[PDB]
Amino acid sequence: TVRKNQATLTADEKRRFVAAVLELKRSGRYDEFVRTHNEFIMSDTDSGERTGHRSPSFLPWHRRFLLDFEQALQSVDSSVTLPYWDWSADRTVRASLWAPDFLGGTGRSTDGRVMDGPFAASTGNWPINVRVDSRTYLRRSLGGSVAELPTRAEVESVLAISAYDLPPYNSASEGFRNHLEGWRGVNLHNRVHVWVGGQMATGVSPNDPVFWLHHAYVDKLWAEWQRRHPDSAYVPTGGTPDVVDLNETMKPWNTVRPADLLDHTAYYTFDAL
């Protein structure tokens, strides 16, 4: 299983990825990923139980959630793997990611509606069902709410941070995890959600297929951090109320721990690391 930079996919690989995503949507399986994600967005709190977000398990949790989604895609087409979007490099609306043969572009100005690509509401193939905003079409406003995606220099400043995470292990933390997540500092992952806009700015952000490509690159940055800091590892390592310690199991699966997900090569490799 090799996870490839989206920019490098062949036309055939793009076609197969899109078709597998559309089939998960048609069959009803896609929307339950969106629902699970929103449940954790709403339940993870700074002062209470926190598992998928704003906590050290943000990274292993999304790594397992993406593995569940990739496995679902492979159950439709076994050749498909999740690509990643390096938003530090492919940083404009003219990027091939946003072309009509891949994810389609930005939303029109009046209502945010995406008007092209395979996920445009006009196709009839991408109903927005799990939603809070009652509108049922994919929406985006690329670069609308924040002017720029993060740069390679900003990403490197975060990869340089030695500590994986720090008490109090929430949105107030110093350390790598919270700077990558983006609640403190120059802001990597949260800012990309804000930059895409539309459903990507919400708790139902997996409604946009770019969600998976964004998180596949956040996941790659975790792998890059590990190679820069082989001496540094996940924390905390036991006994922390409300936080998933290294060897504790994680909801919703309950059968996996951060420890089981630190080494991605158990599951996939990257085109380059």
């Binding site: 709403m42 700074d46 809070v132 905003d133 009652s134 509108r135 949105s171 700015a201 919400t202 708790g203």
Partner: protein, 73 residues
């Protein structure tokens, strides 16, 4: 200490907030909101962009909705 309650018409939508942590409504439909450890707020329709107060989160939700009804959670 919880923020004060509020009630206003913002961009033609009635927004209300009240301590409960804290509940927000847009035309009577409850909107999930959350407080961050540094005292900023977010909502489920603007989760990744902290704003200073629950009223600011309600107003960001009305801006996001562009006139559309909110659905309950």
């Amino acid at each position: 200490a919880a923020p004060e309650s509020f009630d206003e018409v913002y961009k033609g939508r009635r927004i209300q907030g009240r301590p409960a942590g804290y509940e927000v409504f847009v035309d009577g439909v409850q909107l999930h909101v959350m407080r961050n450890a540094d005292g900023s707020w977010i909502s489920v329709v603007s989760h990744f962009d902290p704003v200073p107060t629950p009223r600011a989160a309600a107003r960001a939700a009305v801006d996001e909705l562009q006139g559309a009804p909110l659905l309950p959670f």
